[PDB]
């Protein structure tokens, strides 16, 4: 039990005469606050609010020469309740609408005073970081989202952020299986943004999310396309007696309206047509013009006619195919 008393006296010695107000090496070179992240999971991507909920094992290791011990050849890992008694980087996430550290069972948090002095401080954080969504190519979009770590009150003179490990500082991203997204790539940047007061440190973790078209091609595009095909069926019916053709044509726009109404619930209200509303409206225009084609041919016949029928029949599939080709080419790239 001698080691128990030794650890007790050493911890008491360390925490005695410790000023939380003073950063490590105050009045000296900047303290190199290395960082390390391990994304546990990306819970969801809220495009309506333009933000994503991310849960990560945020960690930040720095050196504090005061918290230096040599007698015990081991790495103490004190209770998480001691963090309030030690200096900590005043880190904040610039784009952070809402976040909290998990509390069950005890406050999820770590301290580990290594023998040299390196303090491995880590928290289990859930963040609803903000991410400006340019949903103009949606659903064929490549939304880019970032987390912006930055010190609040300290300038680059006093503090300095770096990824301990050039790229290994971020881990667990590959195993993440987003529901509607695929994390094509992630990059880590270490800038020094210059503000009015001075140059502040900055680390910008970035994820280049790619929308999973496999889900939405059947969820949204497939019904609309299928209904468009049904519109083509109208032309086959007849011209001598087309009272059925009018009914078949006019039902399709109602189907379109129902599909659109259900779709609008999930989407935001960005004014640009996006890749989705443009296609839905174009299909709406095509079916509407099919109804107008029926109107014109019916008026002319009751007012040569066979040629009008057949020319319309050939014209509609080819021009719709051109529309589909143009749209896919424009938005796929």
């Amino acid at each position: 039990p001698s080691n128990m008393s030794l650890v007790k006296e050493t911890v008491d010695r360390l925490l005695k005469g410790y000023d939380i107000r003073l950063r490590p090496d105050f009045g000296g070179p900047p303290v190199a606050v290395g960082m390390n992240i391990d994304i546990a999971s990306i819970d969801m991507v809220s495009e309506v609010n333009m933000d994503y909920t991310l849960t990560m094992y945020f960690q930040q290791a720095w050196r504090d020469k005061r918290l230096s011990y040599n007698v015990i050849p081991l790495n103490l890992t004190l209770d998480n309740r001691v963090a309030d008694q030690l200096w900590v980087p005043d880190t904040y996430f610039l784009n952070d609408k809402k976040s909290f550290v998990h509390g069950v069972t005890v406050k999820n948090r770590m301290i580990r005073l290594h023998p040299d002095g390196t303090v491995l401080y880590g928290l289990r954080i859930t963040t609803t970081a903000a991410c400006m969504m340019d949903l103009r190519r949606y659903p064929l979009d490549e939304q880019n989202c970032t987390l912006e770590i930055e010190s609040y009150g300290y300038t680059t003179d006093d503090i300095e952020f770096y990824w301990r490990g050039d790229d290994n500082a971020v881990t667990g991203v590959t195993k993440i299986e987003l529901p509607q997204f695929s994390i094509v790539d992630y990059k880590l940047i270490t800038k020094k943004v210059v503000f009015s007061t001075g140059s502040y440190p900055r680390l910008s973790l970035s994820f280049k999310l790619k929308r999973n078209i496999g889900y939405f091609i059947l969820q949204t595009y497939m019904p609309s396309i299928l209904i468009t095909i049904l519109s083509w069926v109208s032309f086959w019916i007849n011209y001598d007696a087309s009272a059925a053709r009018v009914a078949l044509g006019i039902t399709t726009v109602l189907t379109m309206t129902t599909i659109n109404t259900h779709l609008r619930e999930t989407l935001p209200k960005i004014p640009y047509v996006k890749a989705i509303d443009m296609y839905l409206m174009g299909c709406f225009v095509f079916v509407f013009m099919a109804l107008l084609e029926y109107a014109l041919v019916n008026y002319i016949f009751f007012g040569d006619v066979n040629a009008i029928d057949r020319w319309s029949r050939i014209f509609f599939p080819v021009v719709f195919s051109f529309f589909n080709i143009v749209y896919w080419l424009y938005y796929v790239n």
Binding site: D19, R21, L22, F26, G27
Partner: peptide, 30 residues
């Protein structure tokens, strides 16, 4: 020695300060 001066200044700042009253109460607007 720089820290000693700094920490002594921080110690002496709050001495005699009563946060219940705004600066210059009864003398001028804050």
């Amino acid at each position: 020695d720089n820290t000693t001066v700094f920490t002594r200044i921080l110690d002496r700042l709050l001495d005699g300060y009563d946060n219940r009253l705004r600066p210059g109460l009864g003398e001028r607007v804050t």
